[PDB]
Subunit: 139 residues, 10 copies
């Protein structure tokens, strides 16, 4: 734990976040995500909701302006998604407003998770609660 920094961010994630450079991507997945088979280093955040890390990390993480900074997974046809999830993610990320969030199909998302800098799997239970953040040029 450290002062002025959300105690919800583990020491290892703190390191990962700092090591990230312009353009690096990090995923905060829901609890159902196959994080461990993607390839990048995985960090567990089992007792937390994605919205928890988002609000904890946003004052530290500059979002990329050179590319879509926020990406989520699109529900497969014949499946159900929750409208509220994306709503609080935006609220958690609004320091003030945050860029629009774009959804790509689940496979496209995995494909990109495979090249990500790291993956943080949380306890988010809602379906399709996975979100990718692309880092910008930290001022």
């Amino acid at each position: 734990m450290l002062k002025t920094i959300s105690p919800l961010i583990s020491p290892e994630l703190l390191k990962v976040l700092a090591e990230m450079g312009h353009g690096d991507e990090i995923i905060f997945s829901d609890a159902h995500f196959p994080a461990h088979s993607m390839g990048p280093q995985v960090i567990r955040a089992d007792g937390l909701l994605v919205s928890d890390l988002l609000q904890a990390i946003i004052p530290l993480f500059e979002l990329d302006s050179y590319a879509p900074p926020l990406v989520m997974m699109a529900a497969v046809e014949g499946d159900t998604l929750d409208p509220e999830v994306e709503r609080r993610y935006r609220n958690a990320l609004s320091l003030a407003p945050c860029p629009d969030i774009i959804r790509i199909n689940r496979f496209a998302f995995y494909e990109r998770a495979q090249k990500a800098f790291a993956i943080v799997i949380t306890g988010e239970r809602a379906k399709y609660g996975n979100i990718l953040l692309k880092k910008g040029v930290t001022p």
Copy 2:
């Protein structure tokens, strides 16, 4: 995650709990515990309370009936404990929850140095550290 098992328990902690044998000790510490300098493997559980992990693990973890299975830290001289902590931990570990005994910071740290693992949590209370001793799984 997994069905019928608390998702608050990370897979690595699930492995640790399963590997532990009779007499093995694990510590669930508060956020201020010097967990990483004790020696045993450390598992972070930052967003959770000690009482959260205690209740999640108890239906899987039989407590030792051959020796004191629950050990907490005695307040250092010129300092006092928060009454709310121990009572909350007992509640979480309830068969009845065995009695809890206190031992000075020296003896607690000496045992922490030799514990099977240390799970550091987001528990903010002072003296929120607790040592559990595994018994024989029935």
Copy 3:
């Protein structure tokens, strides 16, 4: 071991099952499978039957409903497969609710698929074609 969880599941396997997410695949091979050269981590369960493991894991493992969750190996040219195997695998998998249909794929495609699995658990099953792949779903 732990209470409420089958003792047949090793600590490492419990970790593996918990780490797996939606779509991840895990193989429970018979004793003849070339598990160690496939690529993924290998957990040995020598002396144990695949069916005994399936029955122990099924109450915690959600099978994928987004795609066929069960894949077995088709017999190779000239071989006859023992119907007793798939019969007791489905039974073990039907512990709480009947299990989905099992599909069969060419031995080469099975290996190519084993090369991408999350993990491989090699058991004591001595019958040929006793390998079965499981695909995890979304834990309800």
Copy 4:
């Protein structure tokens, strides 16, 4: 697996048994033993009985004749030990020739001794005091 060798013996255990020399000790513990904190390398054999392993290993493992080759744990104050355990352990060990007498030592001295063992194989034996230590001899 391999021909002429029990399939119940994992590859790692076969290596371990072959590496052991005269006087080296290996423990086959029950499922309750604190094997992972003792120190020596641990091989898991979850779901398997100690007696089933002993019967599989005895034809390859020479028991030491220079010192007591079999050590078991004495029950702790208040506990009763099941005579059925030591009974089937000796039977399994008597596969080709009757096995030596088994000695019992205090739980603390057993652990102190486990800390020096070559390896520890934790099995699926669920009975208490199902731990047994074997000391290798000179392969004739």
Copy 5:
């Protein structure tokens, strides 16, 4: 780098600072300190002043209040401390509130304590006796 947190703190140091608990100790040494032979993990901070790093971490690092949290090295017989080093350090450490009195211990006593430190950050401070140890407290 990150926003909010000073970029003078390398990602590895940030992780270290966060893992430290109440009572844990960290050394920010001058360029002449035998950092690598003490025992704990070392983080190089060549080119940076100790006072640069103290200012960077003070907003995140609560000092121990259960014991003297600031310790520097006493000058060895024949040498004499440069009070300006302490001034700079004191000002960096007093950016939020007056820092506790800074205690000075003998060279060898300092090394002994370093052997048990959580980590050691060797900087570019070229002034003699530019070493300082910080003890962590209960984070508010």
Copy 6:
């Protein structure tokens, strides 16, 4: 060592043989084989002949009946083989010893690169390298 098992087989090779599955390939090379630059794990057996290891392993190692289980190296153009080698290897691997097929140095090395392991021996003969493919243990 171990009773009923050849002491010529090191514990590590004993582990390797046991881990190998159907279709897995292992090479027993002569002393001049570039074993350490192929890729797979290498096990030294310097004082032994390939025929020594072949005979020791055969009572434990069932050979593949689904594909060519024995592969040797074809002599490079402008070079010739020593007749005594292949015949000695067949003798060592005798159920009858399946037929042996030759493949150029390129195809042999390509497979060596992907083999499960390589056991380099003290076999001094030229082209004394042989690749065994494991079958289904009965």
Copy 7:
């Protein structure tokens, strides 16, 4: 620290510069460079300006005369460089020729994936990345 050698160079960087041979390329990046994602080993030099290292390094590092020895990043189209960055760099390097080649952001990343090492500095100036190519030490 060592006499005659700039104390700004960490022992690890000293080792890296010494291990580099003719043609090897090293990058001293700004704080925003995605160094850890490229592939080569990374040396953190947080808080230091690129120009500080260049000045510290140049007396020991011979620049390649067989190929352009200095490469920088061209500004993203439509954007412009801060002329002070390169002026500061040219001075630190004590720079007849050689000139500084400028390659596009991604072309720069491509070449950085194959570099000997990447030293990420505390340089906050936009496009402060510079790649140096070692020559033959006189």
Copy 8:
């Protein structure tokens, strides 16, 4: 394999032998020795007799003159030892004669094997075929 050097010495043993300095000790044990539980690095020489390595290594290994260079294990009371074993060891080591060989009790031998530089376990089947060599000042 290398020219002029016994092909019976594996590459790793070659390295160990060379890394050894004045006073370092190395054990060539029989096949019954508990080499792997002693502590030092172990090298397998399964198809060889101790006498094989001895004759292969002696032209490379200078024996210590500052201390007893050759030590073997004494048979426990109530056990049998082979007179020929020590005989050929001496013959193998005689390049020309080799120092006397002294026997210490089995436990004393293990105790010393625990601090040795390395242990080479061979296929020597004879009981008490273990021998320790102490390296001298290589000329």
Copy 9:
């Protein structure tokens, strides 16, 4: 060090030389070669001349006779080789019999081959183009 074998050969190099098989290649480069970026394991031999190391290993290293076993680097346009380097190398390599003709290939071709070498020994040879590659043959 050892007797019989030249003490100029570090224990790690001796091991490497012995593990090499027919066709394996090793580079003894000059002090300016980019040894560490090629890919293979590197052994430092600072201070020693390439000709010093060639004399040391020739008695133990059979050259390949199935292909040109000796390869050096051609001078880059603008440069010119110092024939005395080759003389020294030739004499060291001819201590037991006339060494095969020494072939010279382009700089980049040499690097390409180095990426696939068994190992690289970078020495203190400060003359340009002091690099030489050896291909191992069937040891008599």
Copy 10:
């Protein structure tokens, strides 16, 4: 290699010397020293004379002024040193004081177990071992 720095110093030795701080001790041993048995990290410098390294190292390495900075091995009782060894060493070091302390063979080993590193050279001279203690870099 690096300009201004002796090419005799390997990159790893350069790193080690740079990491050493005030009071740390480094040993440059002769070829007969049991370096790998002592405990500290070992850097091979086969073929090089101790005096060659000392000459290469001294311009970068400040000797301790707070404690005797040079220690050597006293000859085994009844034996004698070759005066040329130390004369050669004193010259390489460009050596008012300090004097060279001589400790018995085993006392030397004891201190070598706690040294920062051991560089084993090709020095064949009896008792060519020398321990240097680092001071405060000016």
